[PDB]
Amino acid sequence: PGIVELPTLEDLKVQEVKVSSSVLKAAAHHYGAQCDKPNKEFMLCRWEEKDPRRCLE
Amino acid sequence: WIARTFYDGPEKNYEKTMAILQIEAEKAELRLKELEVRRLMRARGDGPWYQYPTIDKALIDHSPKTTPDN
Numbered sequence: 759p760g761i762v763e764l765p766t767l768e769d770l771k772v773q774e775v776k777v778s779s780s781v782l783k784a785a786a787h788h789y790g791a792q793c794d795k796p797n798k799e800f801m802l803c804r805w806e807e808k809d810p811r812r813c814l815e
Numbered sequence: 816w817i818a819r820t821f822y823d824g825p826e827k828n829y830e831k832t833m834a835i836l837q838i839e840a841e842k843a844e845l846r847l848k849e850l851e852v853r854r855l856m857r858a859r860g861d862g863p864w865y866q867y868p869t870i871d872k873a874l875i876d877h878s879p880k881t882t883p884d885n
């Protein structure tokens with residue numbers, strides 16, 4: 759019943775973070791201290807919408 | 816003398832029969848009505864009777880669940 763809506767392949771393109779898990783873990787503490795605001799906005803949107811398609815931006 | 820000392824008048828038995836007949840007629844119509852009401856409640860389930868339990872919604876936990884999509 760109904761048709762599922764999916765974003766197009768162009769809609770899912772982004773400049774990808776191509777560093778490995780060791781680099782990420784080394785940076786993690788300062789990364790969380792510095793990039794807190796966009797991350798918190800995304801996670802609040804993510805548990806409030808309950809939908810990946812509503813959180814792409 | 817026998818009528819005066821042992822028995823009563825006809826009105827007594829007449830009106831006692833009237834009261835008894837009323838009681839029995841109301842009991843009969845109440846029995847029919849109750850049977851129909853029971854049938855309707857068992858079929859439709861909207862009455863106070865034949866109410867079968869369902870899960871209490873106060874047991875549900877409404878909190879963030881480690882994953883955004885529940």
Ligand SMILES: CCCCCCCCCCCCCCCCC[C@@H](O)O[C@H](CO[C@H](O)CCCCCCCCCCCCCCC)COP(=O)(O)OCC[N+](C)(C)C
Nearest residue numbers: 816817818819820821822823824825826827828829830831
């Ligand atoms: C010449 C005579 C001709 C007539 C013969 C009459 C014979 C009388 C004996 C036969 C009686 C038949 C049976 C009757 C039983 C039911 C009677 C009962 O309904 O009356 C009650 C009273 O019952 C009597 O006391 C019963 C009498 C029993 C004795 C009968 C006679 C034989 C007794 C023998 C005893 C022997 C003992 C040993 C001796 C040595 C009170 O009634 P109640 O519910 O208020 O009525 C309401 C209407 N009122 C107010 C107008 C009255």
